[model samples]
Target chain A: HHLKSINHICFSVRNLNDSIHFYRDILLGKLLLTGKKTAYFELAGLWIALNEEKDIPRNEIHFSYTHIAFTIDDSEFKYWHQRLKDNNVNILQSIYFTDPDGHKLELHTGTLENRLNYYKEAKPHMTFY
Target chain B: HHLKSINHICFSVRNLNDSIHFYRDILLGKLLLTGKKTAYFELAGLWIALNEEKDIPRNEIHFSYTHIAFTIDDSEFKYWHQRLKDNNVNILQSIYFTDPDGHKLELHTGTLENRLNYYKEAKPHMTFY
Candidate 1:
């Protein structure tokens, strides 16, 4: 009955192919479409599309450390750590890093489970309407 | 196993209260928690957190039009257009607009349904390995 989910998030990448390799090989995204100037990947519950910078004006490009964080099972942290190490993906910290486009990504255990639990336990202090 | 889902996405906003009003009132995002410096909302299947830029450095802020697009039912597009207009949300195009922080969002009909269909039909010409 409402907007129920994220359709996709798009980011501009300097090189389409390099971003593809990073998302697909390193991050295990399923490559859906590789177009002339863009690419799409199905990563978990989200679709991440990369737009080539050549297609975007120079003024549109900006880099930030803040980004989308993906949830990982607590037991799987070591698996990702090893995978990132093996692939030479830049690690900003033990389990924190930046993608090829400098978008920050972290492997997090704080998940919907915890968020929902918090929602259920906390009472609203203000009205929306 | 690989990353299972997006945990959350964070954005810096000029004002926490204004951002909260826009998201909760206009977009129907469920407020999960609101703190002095940040707030969390559940929009569809994603957790979008907003951070107050008073806590962020001046050199860290930059604006870009590239943004997260959310899927809306084709039948519901008019509902959103009307809802947005009623709330006075800025409309950059018919279905595209900027949130309070100027992060672009589009009410897209391109669901995972179409992407999965395209994925099945299109043969990728490149290998990840």
Candidate 2:
């Protein structure tokens, strides 16, 4: 037995309440627990925790592919497309968006099975030139 | 329902080969597939994908708590400490480390059940004034 699996992805947010509102109200993440410094939410199979770090001077950072993406079947995808729009959540490209902390979030289309096959089918194209 | 669990966490790396070597050799990721633009690796229950983006100029960015953490049994935690030490991977904190791309990663000790209990136990301390 090696490493089991990802426990959670943590983010430092400017305000715990604001972050909680976005994740819980808009994204439908189930609030698990809240502490003075942190809050936890369960999004499907993943647990995302937000640590309030108001004291750290704001020095914004960006990264490519830094977003956390979750799966949404076609029907759920359409539902989010409208839900996010009605809530006025910033829409980047299609289902790609940002959290209250401006951290990127992606609502990737397709189910788990579809994703596995997407990679499995790409193996033939990995040839070296 | 609303949104399903996370499909995968992605990273954009300068050189796919170097990133692949680091993840595969050091972290013990199982390579699912590799393609011209992307590669997939499964670690336990999570899938991590790497995209080769050599054209984009690297602008280093860092965020507090912007790290993916995995649960490791206590015994396995000691094994990683020695393993990473032998491989000479950069160690940030006790068991926290970074990948080749400098993306922060955490090998959190204790099982998932332990973590959930840790949070549940903290509920009593969340009272506001």
Candidate 3:
């Protein structure tokens, strides 16, 4: 098979409500209320799901796992930059950071006019392997 | 001081063109034509950037690192499902799969009417940490 690719990611969080607030309130990710057991963040074109389970390792770092990065334009950069800096969020020399679970997060801004420009040029490019 | 959040994600790939085609042409991700060094995939709200660096661990999975997951709809699931199956992409019993570098990828489809429903209720909830 061609392995079309990943369809979604689910993070096993210890507390579902807390995880939801982290992404929904703190990170401001779009919350897709799937059910009480799960919540999803509509991040760009991908979807991030968090599940409340009994034995989840909250904020544990997985060295083999890569991270999900978000792009911010110049306009939002100042706001976001200030947001992180003002909050005393650990600033990396580069645009990478860690979450409570120690998940690596990378943020960057493109040379575009704004985020809207990004949506305009993006289109469906799906195909078989 | 909100520690705003991730602005974008960049992956250091072995080949720039190959990575671009992988997301843009193969995965049908929206391609933000930047320069030779990088290309951005506008996934939902987060931007997925791939960089061709000399020292990049292509397809290498980072255990401490978490992955970015994509949510697919029922309509697209069959399409993607067929694409991967037709192309011989390995399928995990669950949604999780691995890329060339052995990174984990998970895919899922929500019970929403479709993905558009996700974009509506999401609002910005940024606050200082």
Candidate 4:
């Protein structure tokens, strides 16, 4: 597989303008492109897109634990985390919040290498190869 | 905003082993670490983790259009696309399919640069800044 990299992540939302405001202003994504019902942003070295759908809410949809995590500097973590809380963005612990469509998103202050190291030492049912 | 990059994407599924097989073998992700309930892979220069979720099925959860797109070479696109079909992976045109958790995923043959260029030319109710 000649897979190159992640081109973009797209999320379907109930409202484009509201999601745009959340992702662009609250989440600090640089708005790159926008349409009547879609918006694209360059965030944290990644491309993210939002599309509006007219579907009503569903309880099960909110239960999916699938989430996208963005990396942030540990020094700036508290600022971002607290700011999100101040903005009434429902946060859990460090920084985990659902977007307008209840899509779970996270802000992480650590790298994959750090996780690998910690998990290796505190091996909890984990196997290394 | 000192946001860095997408550290990792975690998908909650019903079974970690099955998801691991699909990601590691079918999707060509390199398995880096695994736990009884979790598995981490380095896919296309990104960290992706699968976490086994015990919750049962919910029809509404399958309705999400949230998807992750991976960049593939145009020359290799046809091969990957057809191979996915051959594996009975329930593919649509080009390459779009759901994972074990019904999380939408796609393989793209273009870059954000290419998309920006095309959309800029064929502006479909879109605004650029």
Candidate 5:
């Protein structure tokens, strides 16, 4: 099936205000809704929902496993790198990751000498957090 | 840790174009960046990022497990319901949930017969999905 794409990305957050400041003013997202159980951002093509603790399960409330990875060219990567460093956001691994969302994501620029070879070389682990 | 607020809500989707169509054109999200592995939306105070399956774990998705519940009034609910149904989209659960990202979400208006009672009566399970 053609999966129809993702509608919105929602998170279980502790504070709505601080998130607003960090994501909206700092990272530059547009605010959609601001409520107790839910807060939202009107970004690109999805609803960014910021959820509260009371509404979601405890285990589901971690940013480490769930994340969005941005694929950047060299210029954009450098821009993001400088911006994040300047803002004091820790750059944990140089391989593939952004922020502190417990998963590894690759932000690559160009392919070396192989395409299918890269896929065969390493496979991401499945079924575990 | 303070737990802070949600930095971003991200998703894994099959198709990037159609998802972009509905989320951006119909639902109204501000596009921040549109790349291959990642796509971002800027809403209220958060970044709504979308991901392709190649970069994420296979079984880690299914909207029903992760969702955002909105708090809306009768008028807003009616508006949303009409808009969605008219657009030929399915309204899976009326009580709580929006779009089609799995998981259940509540869009409540006012408190009724209970306060802490609701939480006590049905404590959300953590061990299982």
Candidate 6:
């Protein structure tokens, strides 16, 4: 239906710190978590990320399937499902897809809050980050 | 600041609009600016952006068994597959598959028949999704 907030921005950057500055400093994103080469930020009520660059270098041999997840209109969900190659899959009620640009992406029907709630109900080992 | 402030403040940031173009041109976002190295927009209220790498940023990389299938129904398989064939939707290996990016996908027929009938034929090769 309408473009809701993002589900997650799974970007793989060469420099996490530089990426982090644009997100955290300029965009006023709040740092929520960090990883060996990754940082997760809360921006516009969504999980915006700047992935670590190391543990591997620029892809001289292969390609990276960076992805972004979008929260589409729920009612249009059924319609889109029926039309868009009929592709379907789920974790939080989503369809895994590849954009024409070869970028991997997701159309999610749930939010972080709802995702956490569902995970709590589905997994007994659910823990907060 | 806080999420409460997000509702009213217009986020004005810089040089990060590759994703802005991708979204506006691809998913039809609501554009709202003309900042020098930046622009403004909302995808259901999410601040969507990415830098113009040709001029800014740096860093590097690394790294899927993931796929999805369309529920094409056990009995409706023929029609869909035929329709796919006529339309030339990349018939990968017969069952009406589409590999948009050398990725795996299928018109998932509810295959209890495969589970049952194959007990006599391809019994040695049983894999399930």
Each candidate's DockQ: 0.46, 0.53, 0.19, 0.74, 0.08, 0.04
The worst-scoring run of ten residues by lDDT in candidate 6 chain B lies at B4-13
Candidate order by TM-score, highest to lowest?
A: 4, 2, 1, 3, 5, 6
What interface RMSD do all candidates show, one decimal each?
Answer: 4.2, 3.8, 9.9, 1.6, 14.3, 16.9
| Model 2 chain B poorest 10 in a row by lDDT | B56-65
Better of 2 and 3 by DockQ: 2
Candidate 3 chain A, poorest ten consecutive residues by summed lDDT: A120-129
Clashing pairs in 1: none
DockQ, cand. 2: 0.53
How big is the positional error of residue B38 in model 6, measured in Å on the Cα after superposition? 32
DockQ of model 4 vs. true complex:
0.74
lDDT of each: 0.75, 0.75, 0.54, 0.80, 0.48, 0.44
Model 1 docking grade: acceptable
Span of 10 residues, lowest total lDDT, candidate 5 chain B: B120-129
> For residue B22, what is the lDDT in candidate 2?
81
For B67-104, candidate 2 gives per-residue lDDT tens digits of 89887777676789989889888788128888766788
lDDT for each residue of candidate 6 in B1-129, tens digit (9 for 90 to 100): 222212211221223454454346533566654334434455545433322324222333222222223344456666656655665555661253433223233445443334335543654343221
Best by lDDT: 4
Model 5 C-alpha lDDT versus the unseen true structure = 0.48
For residues B1-129, could you state the per-residue lDDT of candidate 3 as single tens digits? 222344555566666675665566655677755555656666554556665565655454343234445566545666776665665555561255544444455555653334434434452232211
Q: Compared with the true structure, what per-residue lDDT tens digits does model 6 show for residues A52-129?
A: 545333445322322345555566566545544543222226666543223354556665556545656776363333
Poorest stretch of ten by lDDT in candidate 3 chain B: B120-129
Clashing pairs in 6: A1-A73, A3-B44, A14-B59, A14-B60, A15-B59, A37-A52, B15-B37
Q: What digit string (tens of lDDT, one per residue) describes model 3 on residues A45-77?
A: 455766666565545534323555565654676
Each candidate's TM vs. the true structure? Answer: 0.81, 0.83, 0.54, 0.92, 0.41, 0.27
Instruction: Return the top candidate by TM-score.
Output: 4
Q: Each model's fnat?
A: 0.64, 0.68, 0.22, 0.84, 0.10, 0.08
